[PDB]
Structures are given as C-alpha cells and as structure tokens.
C-alpha cells in the first residue's frame, strides 16, 4: 500500500538512481516573482532554467514541491471541501529536464515507476497522448507495449500544455489508473501522472516553433496516489491526511460521513489546516491584502464552517500541532516555526471569531428576510455592510448566500464600493474606479 511519505522518498530516490539532483522544494512563496501568489507547479521554481535564463550543475532534477492552488489561472480554492480531489495545499512530486532527455526516456522512466516501484498493474494503466503526437504514441504503443485499446488521443485542450499564452510549451501524456467498474468518468480513471513534453515555443502570433533543446516536466500529486495504492476513494482519506478530519470530528463532535454538508466543513478544516500552516510557516502574514490576505480568508473560511459544526471556540490552533507531528518527518523545518504558526492562528481566530459569529447572525438574518419577500438576491448594501463592517471576506458572503439559494448583486456592490470610495474623496492597494468590485474580492475592506 505504501504511505504517503513513503511514495514521496521512493518517487525522489527512484529518480536520483536516474542520474537527477534532488531538488529541495521551493518555499510557497515566489522569491523573485510579485504576480504570482503562491507557487502552483513543482516546474515553477525552474522557470527560468526552462527558459536557459538560468544554469544548474544538473540537467536532471526531481522534487516534491510544496503547492497551491488558490490564485490567478489555478484557483481550486472555491472547490475545496465539495469534492474529494480539491485542495489548496498539495505536494506534487517532479522530474524534469533542461535540454537532456525526452519523451522516450520521460515516459520509460514513469512506466518503471510505476509499474515496478508503485507495483501498480500494467493492465489497469491508461495512458492518453496528443492526437497528432504520433512519437509519444508509437513509444508507449511499440516501445513500451501499450495495446492500442488503452491508449488515447485526445485534444489540444487534453493533451497540450502551455508555459503561458506565448512561451515553452508542447504535447502532454497522462498516466490514468482504472479503479475498477465500480466508479465512472474521471474517477474511474483516475489520472495520477501528467507527462508535459515541452517541444516548441508559442510567439506572439501563436505560431509554433521547436525548441534547440526540448524540455520535460513532470507533476505527480502525491494525495492523489498515496489514495489509489492505499485503496482510498478520497484523498482525505489517506494516511496524512484522515487524522485531520478525526481532528475535525472531534472538535465538534460530529462523525464524518454521514452528512454531505457535514463533510463539507470537516474537508475545508482539515485541507486549510494544511495550507495555513505551510503557507505561516514559510513567512505568509494574515493580512488585508495579496498573499497575506489568501491565507486569511482561508483561515477564516475553516473558522466560518468551524462555526458551522458547532465549534464555539478557536480551535484551528490546536489542528497546527497536528499537521507539524504528521509532516515533520518531510519538512522537518515545520518544528522550528511549530510555535510561531500555532501562536498565529490563534491570534487570528481570537481576533475575529466573535467578529465571525456576529456577521454570521446579520447574514442570515438579511438572507432570511429576503427569501421571505421574495428577493433572489443579496442587496450591494448588504454584501458591503457584512464586508465593511463584519470584515467578511466577498467570497464567503457569495458561498454563505448560495447555501441558501441567493446571490449578490454584483453591480450593487459595485457602485456601494464607489460611494465609499467616494466618501474618502468627498465627506498599500491601488485600483481603477469599476474595478473596486474585482478587487474587493482579493483584499479586506480596510485595504480600499
């Protein structure tokens, strides 16, 4: 079955044995890099030496990078806690190579991994390839035996990956796992493996062009396949990650899986937990704005569906200690800053929590009552009051809301936004004015 840190340290050696340098996991937070957030990809932190703007004294490298997924192109944010397959911090195990070797080796090596080290059977194994990739068919097809009724070729919008709009991009496989004719669609099969074979390089006409030197990356998400070889239909479920949702059920006392709603809140608490402390631990400060204020609203979204189960007290303090003790082993850093963290989140909570249940009772107050007169809405001036004067974050106002079956009036809000904007003008965080509905949904109030 093997645990989850177990795959990690096979995934990170097996390709060692291949000639790659072990490459620590980059902090969450970008460097050198203000437009992006947080780090999404293991082959972020090796942009550049993609792009031969950097050198490494390794052209073959491999990591389990720390990510998440909850801004700009990759937001999975709004999701997490719905389904079984969102997070928002996620570790995605890589290989990759800067002008070395290619699609035949990339996929040799995955195949290897894969079927000798996961021990994961061949004839369960699914494999899709771009339609007009005929290389990458003819190596798994030929090369690597692959009956053709297990391979697939699909599109642009399946098998391409692209670096951005322009840039580095090229055909991708994906290695899916056939879980058996008990579940459906993705499910079923179960992609565990994504294979980018970065060939060309997009221009500003969209034209494509070769690369002089090819490159390859890989991401493999470490719960995803911790969940298949531990025979688990959720990577909740898995061995790092069950005891915090126990930690969730015992808290509020309630029993997970029994109630879909009451699951909901368990997976939101257990996931944040995990991105909270990551994200505190590498130097993310609660804040009303950009990365500071991501890790906010997450933090006050578990605290919101905390609330939700019964939980009257902090408590997201208490889960740090836990996923310090489950993930010290891989991140042994998590100790040092175990305190620190823990001394955060409880700041945080006992700063809003009576702020949270207030806010609450006023929202489904007003929500109430519009239901009763027959709105479908949330007036603008209601979506500002819980955001100016409960600090409700924009996007916990909308999900509050559509648990009820309303909206918000977007355009309200909007202008509601101007008029205090107007009120600083009349009677840090820059934005154009009918843009302060947008940005609003990425900072606090105080921000604007």
Avoid at 236 to 264: A, C, H, N
């Amino acid at each position: 079955s093997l645990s989850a840190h177990e795959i990690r340290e096979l995934f990170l050696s097996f390709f060692e044995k291949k000639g790659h340098t072990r490459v620590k996991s980059a902090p969450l937070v970008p460097e050198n890099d203000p437009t992006l957030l947080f780090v999404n990809a293991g082959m972020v932190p090796f942009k550049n030496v993609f792009l031969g703007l950097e050198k490494r004294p390794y052209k073959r490298a491999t990591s389990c990078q720390k990510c998440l997924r909850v801004s700009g192109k990759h937001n999975d944010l709004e999701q997490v806690g719905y389904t079984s397959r969102h997070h928002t911090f996620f570790e995605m195990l890589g290989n990759f190579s800067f002008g070395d070797y290619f699609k035949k080796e990339a996929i040799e090596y995955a195949w290897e991994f894969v079927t000798e080290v996961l021990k994961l059977p061949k004839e369960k194994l699914y494999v899709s390839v771009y339609k007009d990739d005929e290389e990458a068919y003819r190596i798994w097809n030929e090369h690597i035996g692959i009956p053709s009724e297990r391979i697939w070729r699909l599109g642009e919008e399946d098998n391409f990956w692209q670096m951005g709009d322009v840039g580095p991009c090229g055909p991708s496989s994906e290695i899916y796992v056939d879980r058996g004719e008990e579940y459906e669609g993705d499910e079923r099969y179960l992609e565990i493996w994504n294979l980018v074979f970065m060939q060309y390089n997009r221009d500003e006409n969209g034209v494509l062009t070769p690369l002089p030197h090819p490159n390859i990356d890989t991401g493999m998400g470490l719960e995803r396949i911790a969940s298949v070889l531990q025979g688990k239909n959720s990577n909740f479920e898995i061995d790092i990650i069950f005891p915090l949702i126990q930690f969730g059920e015992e808290v509020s006392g309630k029993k997970y899986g029994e109630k879909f709603e009451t699951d909901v809140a368990l997976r939101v608490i257990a996931d944040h937990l995990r991105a909270i402390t990551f994200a505190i631990s590498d130097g993310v400060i609660p804040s009303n704005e950009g990365r500071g204020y991501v890790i906010r609203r997450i933090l006050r979204r578990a605290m919101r569906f905390g609330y939700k189960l019964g939980i009257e007290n902090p408590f997201l303090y208490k889960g740090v200690d836990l996923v310090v003790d489950i993930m010290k082993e891989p991140y042994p850093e998590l100790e040092l800053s175990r305190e620190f963290v823990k001394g955060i989140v409880k700041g945080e909570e006992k700063r809003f929590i009576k702020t949270l249940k207030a806010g609450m009772e006023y929202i489904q107050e007003v929500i109430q009552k519009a239901l009763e007169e027959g709105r479908k809405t949330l007036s603008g001036k209601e979506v500002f009051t819980a955001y100016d004067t409960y600090g409700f974050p924009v996007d916990l106002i909308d999900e509050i809301a559509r648990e009820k079956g309303l909206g918000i009036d977007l355009e309200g809000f909007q202008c509601e936004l101007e008029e205090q904007r107007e009120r600083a003008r009349k009677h840090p965080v820059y934005s154009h004015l009918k843009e302060l509905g947008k940005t609003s949904a990425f900072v606090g109030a105080a921000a604007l």
